[PDB]
């Protein structure tokens, strides 16, 4: 675990991060995609071995000794707000069952079904708090990556508001 476990926000490539593993927002198919998936598909190719997993699941493949946990939140543009909230709920909890059984001391993670699976609503509270909700009890440091400045602000606030 982590010294003094904390969240942290970073406005930049989920590609270039500094933490000892990565949550890709997948597709359910293992495909290349577009947004963080691809970049993620750019960085780390040979972990898509494999990595189709349903909606509200999160399944790990190796890229060499490093985890890429893909993540696979639901595409608002076919789910209701009540089945999308309970699948986005989901995935999260699986996520955070992926980083306790890897031991890492750090995890990069983006905000699930904020971006082409939004179903063109702002969905930045919604799925930082399930976020918060999962991740609470391990002992990772967690950092969010994300691409917009007042993203960034929105998320940064919401942290330090619970500190
Ligand atoms: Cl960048
Ligand atoms: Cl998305
Ligand atoms: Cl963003």
């Not at 493949?61 to 309970?86: K, L, Q």
Request: aromatic content about 8%; overall charge neutral; hydrophobic content about 35%.
């Amino acid at each position: 675990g982590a010294m003094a476990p904390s969240y942290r926000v970073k406005r930049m490539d989920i590609a270039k991060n500094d933490e000892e593993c990565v949550v890709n927002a997948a597709n359910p198919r293992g495909l290349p995609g577009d947004g963080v998936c691809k970049a993620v598909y750019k960085k780390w190719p040979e972990s898509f071995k494999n990595s189709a997993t349903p909606v509200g699941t999160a399944k790990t493949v190796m890229c060499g000794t490093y985890p890429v946990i893909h993540a696979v939140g639901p595409n608002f543009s076919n789910y209701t707000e009540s089945e999308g909230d309970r699948e986005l709920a989901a995935a999260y909890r699986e996520v955070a069952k992926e980083v306790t059984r890897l031991g890492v001391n750090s995890v990069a993670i983006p905000l699930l079904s904020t971006g082409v699976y939004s179903g063109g609503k702002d969905r930045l509270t919604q799925s930082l708090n399930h976020l918060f909700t999962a991740m609470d009890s391990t002992d990772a440091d967690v950092v969010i990556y994300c691409r917009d400045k007042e993203w960034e602000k929105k998320i940064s606030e919401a942290i330090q508001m619970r500190t």
